[PDB]
Amino acid sequence: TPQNITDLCAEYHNTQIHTLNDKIFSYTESLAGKREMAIITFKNGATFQVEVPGSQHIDSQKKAIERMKDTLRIAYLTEAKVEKLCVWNNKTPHAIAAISMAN
Amino acid sequence: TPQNITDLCAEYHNTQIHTLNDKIFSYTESLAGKREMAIITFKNGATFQVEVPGSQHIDSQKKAIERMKDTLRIAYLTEAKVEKLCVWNNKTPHAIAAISMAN
Amino acid sequence: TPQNITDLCAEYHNTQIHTLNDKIFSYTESLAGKREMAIITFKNGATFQVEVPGSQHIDSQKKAIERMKDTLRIAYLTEAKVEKLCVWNNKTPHAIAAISMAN
Amino acid sequence: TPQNITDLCAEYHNTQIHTLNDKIFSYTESLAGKREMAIITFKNGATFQVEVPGSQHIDSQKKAIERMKDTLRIAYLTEAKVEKLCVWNNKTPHAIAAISMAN
Amino acid sequence: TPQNITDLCAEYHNTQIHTLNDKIFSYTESLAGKREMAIITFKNGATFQVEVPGSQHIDSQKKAIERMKDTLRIAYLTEAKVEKLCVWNNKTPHAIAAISMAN
Ligand SMILES: O=C(NCCN1CCOCC1)c1cc(O[C@H]2O[C@H](CO)[C@H](O)[C@H](O)[C@H]2O)cc([N+](=O)[O-])c1
Ligand SMILES: O=C(NCCN1CCOCC1)c1cc(O[C@H]2O[C@H](CO)[C@H](O)[C@H](O)[C@H]2O)cc([N+](=O)[O-])c1
Ligand SMILES: O=C(NCCN1CCOCC1)c1cc(O[C@H]2O[C@H](CO)[C@H](O)[C@H](O)[C@H]2O)cc([N+](=O)[O-])c1
Ligand SMILES: O=C(NCCN1CCOCC1)c1cc(O[C@H]2O[C@H](CO)[C@H](O)[C@H](O)[C@H]2O)cc([N+](=O)[O-])c1
Ligand SMILES: O=C(NCCN1CCOCC1)c1cc(O[C@H]2O[C@H](CO)[C@H](O)[C@H](O)[C@H]2O)cc([N+](=O)[O-])c1
């Protein structure tokens, strides 16, 4: 198994690492039908989503999607610094695959 | 895809954005039958609900409704500033579709 | 839908509003069989329960009962002021139907 | 229903009350197979478990066991004073049936 | 039934204790398919995983794996000192079986 987010991210196509080293600037979540998602931004303007669950996800990812939204909310509220995001860059906004927090 | 709450809200009929830029003033929740819901108010008197789950909601919204109540409770308790609410205005109190939090 | 806890409470028989405007003084929870419940008290001694789930509860209430115990625990630990409780007064301790929190 | 943890405890065989009036000194939790459990200790050395779910438990206790582990973890992390534990004393470590917190 | 993490760890093949007595330095979590996992590190470089749920795990462990990831996230965010980890050291990074928090 990978030992860090960069190596994990590299195991997938259409991904990249974004380095933020900053707290989340805004947290948005929706219960509207077909847009059951979260969106975060950083003060540099960078915007990321947790995608709506769909046919692109395998069953094992469903619980992890819900956990990621839990993690973003509590990171936002505690002002935790986000080190890196692994995202899929074939989506707009880029779609989060993994998060690392440090400092 | 939408990149913010205003753009998301616009995708739906019978919605509008309320701009609060304030912490929640009160948080109410109920387990009484057929009123399993949350109500929030702001100091300006504005009152909003998370609707009781019902036939107006598709399955994917049910988990998101539960998450929204989780979010309002911890936003309340942490005195997190609510930036905007996307609501359906064909309900009384206006029914929350989405929330954004920012500093 | 109700604008506030008082109007919600009034929709049910055997209910009353208790106005506390105080933090919870003690929190008790049990996993013992047939007593899977929570009990809270206030400084003046007044005691309230979240009832064990049972045949008086409709299915939609089961999730809301679990949420209420979550809410009471974090309210307790954060010393959040409880404004009002809506309770069923045909049970001893009075059984919580809804809670409002406000500063 | 009982008004307090001492009366609750008295409804069961093989139980006793421990009065700690202290924060939890250590929190341990395990995902190891057949030992999916929590263990807490106090400064004086007293040790308690949340038992692995088992055939001695009825279905209504399953959710309550998971909630108890949630409660112990957050009590530990917040240094919340534990007033009393109701335990089964026919297990080693004694098995938690109920907890009360009062500052 | 064990009284502490060391004795629990010793009930399993291919385990060891790590004594850290330090807060978590970084927290990583992923929703990427087949890598639905968490990774933590300490300032001395020690790296640990919560494994992806899989054929090595029995049913009873599934909730406990989810709980473990919850615990590591909140330990990280609260800067809780980790005393010891019980791990399987037949995996790279070593795989967490249990955690103790103290002091
Ligand atoms: O949130 C919605 N999501 C879209 C997803 N689904 C596709 C079509 O079948 C059902 C909904 C959605 C909300 C709609 O609105 C209705 O439901 C809302 C809660 O979901 C609110 O209760 C609102 O007051 C009500 O009018 C109406 C429609 N619509 O009339 O198509 C879609
Ligand atoms: O919260 C309730 N709303 C809807 C649930 N209903 C419960 C009974 O089966 C029918 C549906 C509700 C509460 C009712 O009250 C009953 O259940 C309560 C918990 O729900 C309390 O336990 C209360 O002490 C008890 O009398 C009675 C009715 N009723 O007689 O219609 C409705
Ligand atoms: O034999 C039991 N029930 C029937 C006896 N009566 C039940 C009502 O109280 C008074 C005595 C009985 C045994 C119980 O205890 C058993 O299960 C416990 C976990 O639930 C502990 O594991 C305990 O170590 C174990 O002996 C517990 C309960 N319970 O939590 O309801 C009932
Ligand atoms: O955690 C296990 N629980 C099963 C029950 N307990 C097993 C040990 O004796 C006490 C009872 C268990 C773990 C085992 O170990 C395996 O799974 C671990 C995760 O569970 C790790 O993935 C570890 O790297 C791996 O070797 C192997 C077996 N097995 O081959 O049956 C059981
Ligand atoms: O995260 C992946 N995990 C590996 C499991 N795979 C899931 C899809 O079915 C194939 C097996 C995975 C991600 C993939 O990426 C796809 O899904 C992502 C969400 O999971 C994002 O939505 C991304 O935008 C999309 O391209 C594509 C594949 N793929 O083409 O195999 C695998």
mmCIF file of N, CA and C in Angstrom, chain A residues 5-70:
data_model
loop_
_atom_site.group_PDB
_atom_site.id
_atom_site.type_symbol
_atom_site.label_atom_id
_atom_site.label_comp_id
_atom_site.label_asym_id
_atom_site.label_seq_id
_atom_site.Cartn_x
_atom_site.Cartn_y
_atom_site.Cartn_z
ATOM 1 N N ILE A 5 0.148 10.497 0.210
ATOM 2 C CA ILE A 5 -0.881 10.893 -0.739
ATOM 3 C C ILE A 5 -0.352 11.036 -2.162
ATOM 4 N N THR A 6 0.906 11.447 -2.314
ATOM 5 C CA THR A 6 1.444 11.658 -3.670
ATOM 6 C C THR A 6 1.538 10.330 -4.396
ATOM 7 N N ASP A 7 2.070 9.321 -3.693
ATOM 8 C CA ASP A 7 2.213 7.995 -4.328
ATOM 9 C C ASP A 7 0.850 7.375 -4.552
ATOM 10 N N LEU A 8 -0.063 7.567 -3.587
ATOM 11 C CA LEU A 8 -1.417 7.047 -3.811
ATOM 12 C C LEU A 8 -2.033 7.666 -5.060
ATOM 13 N N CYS A 9 -1.930 8.989 -5.153
ATOM 14 C CA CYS A 9 -2.543 9.710 -6.249
ATOM 15 C C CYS A 9 -2.024 9.218 -7.581
ATOM 16 N N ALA A 10 -0.752 8.885 -7.674
ATOM 17 C CA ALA A 10 -0.115 8.435 -8.895
ATOM 18 C C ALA A 10 -0.614 7.087 -9.403
ATOM 19 N N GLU A 11 -1.339 6.333 -8.584
ATOM 20 C CA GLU A 11 -1.832 5.015 -9.007
ATOM 21 C C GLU A 11 -3.035 5.118 -9.937
ATOM 22 N N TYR A 12 -3.547 6.327 -10.156
ATOM 23 C CA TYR A 12 -4.761 6.569 -10.903
ATOM 24 C C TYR A 12 -4.496 7.494 -12.081
ATOM 25 N N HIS A 13 -5.180 7.271 -13.187
ATOM 26 C CA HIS A 13 -5.195 8.209 -14.281
ATOM 27 C C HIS A 13 -6.067 9.432 -13.990
ATOM 28 N N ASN A 14 -5.791 10.519 -14.715
ATOM 29 C CA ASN A 14 -6.531 11.769 -14.633
ATOM 30 C C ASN A 14 -6.511 12.365 -13.235
ATOM 31 N N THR A 15 -5.398 12.224 -12.522
ATOM 32 C CA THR A 15 -5.258 12.877 -11.243
ATOM 33 C C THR A 15 -4.067 13.838 -11.235
ATOM 34 N N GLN A 16 -4.116 14.682 -10.199
ATOM 35 C CA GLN A 16 -2.953 15.498 -9.880
ATOM 36 C C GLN A 16 -3.035 15.879 -8.400
ATOM 37 N N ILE A 17 -1.863 16.223 -7.872
ATOM 38 C CA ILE A 17 -1.765 16.807 -6.568
ATOM 39 C C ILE A 17 -1.831 18.329 -6.661
ATOM 40 N N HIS A 18 -2.687 18.921 -5.812
ATOM 41 C CA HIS A 18 -2.667 20.334 -5.543
ATOM 42 C C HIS A 18 -2.067 20.517 -4.136
ATOM 43 N N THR A 19 -1.092 21.415 -4.001
ATOM 44 C CA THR A 19 -0.542 21.707 -2.684
ATOM 45 C C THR A 19 -1.132 23.015 -2.188
ATOM 46 N N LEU A 20 -1.811 22.968 -1.042
ATOM 47 C CA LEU A 20 -2.510 24.136 -0.523
ATOM 48 C C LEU A 20 -1.750 24.760 0.645
ATOM 49 N N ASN A 21 -1.369 23.892 1.593
ATOM 50 C CA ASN A 21 -0.802 24.349 2.845
ATOM 51 C C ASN A 21 -1.524 25.547 3.461
ATOM 52 N N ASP A 22 -2.838 25.340 3.589
ATOM 53 C CA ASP A 22 -3.695 26.429 4.057
ATOM 54 C C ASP A 22 -5.003 25.845 4.556
ATOM 55 N N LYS A 23 -5.669 26.603 5.409
ATOM 56 C CA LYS A 23 -6.990 26.212 5.860
ATOM 57 C C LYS A 23 -8.013 26.440 4.765
ATOM 58 N N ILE A 24 -9.147 25.728 4.899
ATOM 59 C CA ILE A 24 -10.262 25.916 3.983
ATOM 60 C C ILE A 24 -10.922 27.270 4.175
ATOM 61 N N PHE A 25 -11.171 27.973 3.056
ATOM 62 C CA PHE A 25 -11.780 29.318 3.128
ATOM 63 C C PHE A 25 -13.293 29.274 3.198
ATOM 64 N N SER A 26 -13.909 28.351 2.453
ATOM 65 C CA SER A 26 -15.361 28.183 2.509
ATOM 66 C C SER A 26 -15.732 26.716 2.323
ATOM 67 N N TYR A 27 -16.856 26.372 2.927
ATOM 68 C CA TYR A 27 -17.447 25.029 2.890
ATOM 69 C C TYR A 27 -18.899 25.178 2.440
ATOM 70 N N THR A 28 -19.310 24.465 1.432
ATOM 71 C CA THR A 28 -20.657 24.469 0.901
ATOM 72 C C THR A 28 -21.150 23.021 0.787
ATOM 73 N N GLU A 29 -22.385 22.786 1.223
ATOM 74 C CA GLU A 29 -22.953 21.445 1.019
ATOM 75 C C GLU A 29 -24.412 21.585 0.622
ATOM 76 N N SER A 30 -24.823 20.628 -0.200
ATOM 77 C CA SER A 30 -26.141 20.633 -0.814
ATOM 78 C C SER A 30 -26.869 19.316 -0.618
ATOM 79 N N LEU A 31 -28.197 19.427 -0.353
ATOM 80 C CA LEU A 31 -29.066 18.254 -0.352
ATOM 81 C C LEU A 31 -30.000 18.260 -1.549
ATOM 82 N N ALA A 32 -29.895 19.190 -2.470
ATOM 83 C CA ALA A 32 -30.729 19.274 -3.649
ATOM 84 C C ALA A 32 -30.510 18.051 -4.534
ATOM 85 N N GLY A 33 -31.622 17.582 -5.116
ATOM 86 C CA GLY A 33 -31.582 16.337 -5.855
ATOM 87 C C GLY A 33 -30.638 16.406 -7.039
ATOM 88 N N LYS A 34 -29.806 15.385 -7.149
ATOM 89 C CA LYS A 34 -28.802 15.242 -8.174
ATOM 90 C C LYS A 34 -27.603 16.164 -7.929
ATOM 91 N N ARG A 35 -27.605 16.944 -6.846
ATOM 92 C CA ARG A 35 -26.473 17.792 -6.484
ATOM 93 C C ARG A 35 -26.139 17.621 -4.995
ATOM 94 N N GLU A 36 -26.178 16.351 -4.547
ATOM 95 C CA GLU A 36 -25.863 15.999 -3.179
ATOM 96 C C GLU A 36 -24.343 15.905 -3.062
ATOM 97 N N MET A 37 -23.751 17.066 -2.806
ATOM 98 C CA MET A 37 -22.322 17.256 -2.963
ATOM 99 C C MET A 37 -21.814 18.272 -1.957
ATOM 100 N N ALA A 38 -20.494 18.351 -1.863
ATOM 101 C CA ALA A 38 -19.822 19.380 -1.099
ATOM 102 C C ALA A 38 -18.854 20.089 -2.036
ATOM 103 N N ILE A 39 -18.661 21.369 -1.777
ATOM 104 C CA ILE A 39 -17.707 22.213 -2.497
ATOM 105 C C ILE A 39 -16.886 22.992 -1.476
ATOM 106 N N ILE A 40 -15.554 22.979 -1.616
ATOM 107 C CA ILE A 40 -14.715 23.793 -0.764
ATOM 108 C C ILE A 40 -13.907 24.763 -1.638
ATOM 109 N N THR A 41 -13.547 25.906 -1.035
ATOM 110 C CA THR A 41 -12.619 26.800 -1.676
ATOM 111 C C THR A 41 -11.508 27.209 -0.717
ATOM 112 N N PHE A 42 -10.433 27.690 -1.299
ATOM 113 C CA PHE A 42 -9.275 28.200 -0.639
ATOM 114 C C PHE A 42 -9.166 29.690 -1.005
ATOM 115 N N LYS A 43 -8.452 30.421 -0.140
ATOM 116 C CA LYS A 43 -8.404 31.860 -0.370
ATOM 117 C C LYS A 43 -7.689 32.174 -1.673
ATOM 118 N N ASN A 44 -6.926 31.290 -2.277
ATOM 119 C CA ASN A 44 -6.346 31.573 -3.592
ATOM 120 C C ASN A 44 -7.330 31.389 -4.730
ATOM 121 N N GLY A 45 -8.558 31.031 -4.409
ATOM 122 C CA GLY A 45 -9.571 30.860 -5.432
ATOM 123 C C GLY A 45 -9.842 29.434 -5.812
ATOM 124 N N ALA A 46 -8.945 28.549 -5.391
ATOM 125 C CA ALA A 46 -9.036 27.173 -5.814
ATOM 126 C C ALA A 46 -10.311 26.538 -5.267
ATOM 127 N N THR A 47 -11.033 25.793 -6.107
ATOM 128 C CA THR A 47 -12.317 25.204 -5.781
ATOM 129 C C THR A 47 -12.312 23.721 -6.094
ATOM 130 N N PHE A 48 -12.850 22.957 -5.163
ATOM 131 C CA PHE A 48 -12.857 21.511 -5.273
ATOM 132 C C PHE A 48 -14.207 20.940 -4.856
ATOM 133 N N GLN A 49 -14.586 19.807 -5.432
ATOM 134 C CA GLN A 49 -15.816 19.155 -5.053
ATOM 135 C C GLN A 49 -15.579 17.765 -4.497
ATOM 136 N N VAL A 50 -16.536 17.327 -3.659
ATOM 137 C CA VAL A 50 -16.731 15.913 -3.463
ATOM 138 C C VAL A 50 -17.890 15.570 -4.390
ATOM 139 N N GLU A 51 -17.666 14.727 -5.387
ATOM 140 C CA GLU A 51 -18.707 14.434 -6.350
ATOM 141 C C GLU A 51 -19.945 13.789 -5.728
ATOM 142 N N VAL A 52 -21.048 14.020 -6.400
ATOM 143 C CA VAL A 52 -22.284 13.295 -6.134
ATOM 144 C C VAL A 52 -22.009 11.816 -6.350
ATOM 145 N N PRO A 53 -22.440 10.928 -5.470
ATOM 146 C CA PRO A 53 -22.252 9.501 -5.733
ATOM 147 C C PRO A 53 -23.023 9.109 -6.982
ATOM 148 N N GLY A 54 -22.518 8.268 -7.830
ATOM 149 C CA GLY A 54 -22.784 7.834 -9.132
ATOM 150 C C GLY A 54 -22.112 6.566 -9.607
ATOM 151 N N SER A 55 -22.379 6.311 -10.888
ATOM 152 C CA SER A 55 -22.076 5.006 -11.475
ATOM 153 C C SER A 55 -20.599 4.791 -11.728
ATOM 154 N N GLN A 56 -19.744 5.747 -11.565
ATOM 155 C CA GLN A 56 -18.327 6.042 -11.638
ATOM 156 C C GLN A 56 -17.663 5.564 -10.335
ATOM 157 N N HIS A 57 -18.451 5.415 -9.280
ATOM 158 C CA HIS A 57 -17.999 4.913 -8.003
ATOM 159 C C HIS A 57 -18.334 3.445 -7.808
ATOM 160 N N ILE A 58 -17.380 2.719 -7.248
ATOM 161 C CA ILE A 58 -17.678 1.335 -6.899
ATOM 162 C C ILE A 58 -18.230 1.341 -5.486
ATOM 163 N N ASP A 59 -18.840 0.240 -5.084
ATOM 164 C CA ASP A 59 -19.606 0.212 -3.823
ATOM 165 C C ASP A 59 -18.738 0.593 -2.630
ATOM 166 N N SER A 60 -17.490 0.121 -2.620
ATOM 167 C CA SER A 60 -16.569 0.401 -1.521
ATOM 168 C C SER A 60 -16.280 1.892 -1.417
ATOM 169 N N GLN A 61 -16.462 2.681 -2.461
ATOM 170 C CA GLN A 61 -16.210 4.127 -2.312
ATOM 171 C C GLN A 61 -17.359 4.876 -1.631
ATOM 172 N N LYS A 62 -18.567 4.316 -1.546
ATOM 173 C CA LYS A 62 -19.723 5.067 -1.051
ATOM 174 C C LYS A 62 -19.497 5.552 0.374
ATOM 175 N N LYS A 63 -19.063 4.659 1.274
ATOM 176 C CA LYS A 63 -18.826 5.056 2.667
ATOM 177 C C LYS A 63 -17.701 6.062 2.745
ATOM 178 N N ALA A 64 -16.687 5.888 1.909
ATOM 179 C CA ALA A 64 -15.554 6.815 1.931
ATOM 180 C C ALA A 64 -15.907 8.216 1.435
ATOM 181 N N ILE A 65 -16.829 8.315 0.493
ATOM 182 C CA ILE A 65 -17.342 9.624 0.050
ATOM 183 C C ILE A 65 -17.991 10.353 1.203
ATOM 184 N N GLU A 66 -18.846 9.621 1.949
ATOM 185 C CA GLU A 66 -19.494 10.251 3.099
ATOM 186 C C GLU A 66 -18.456 10.664 4.140
ATOM 187 N N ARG A 67 -17.445 9.810 4.379
ATOM 188 C CA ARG A 67 -16.397 10.210 5.314
ATOM 189 C C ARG A 67 -15.660 11.463 4.859
ATOM 190 N N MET A 68 -15.350 11.569 3.574
ATOM 191 C CA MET A 68 -14.645 12.752 3.086
ATOM 192 C C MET A 68 -15.405 14.031 3.332
ATOM 193 N N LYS A 69 -16.730 14.017 3.128
ATOM 194 C CA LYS A 69 -17.496 15.217 3.461
ATOM 195 C C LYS A 69 -17.467 15.513 4.952
ATOM 196 N N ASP A 70 -17.504 14.484 5.793
ATOM 197 C CA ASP A 70 -17.328 14.672 7.257
ATOM 198 C C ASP A 70 -15.969 15.336 7.539
#
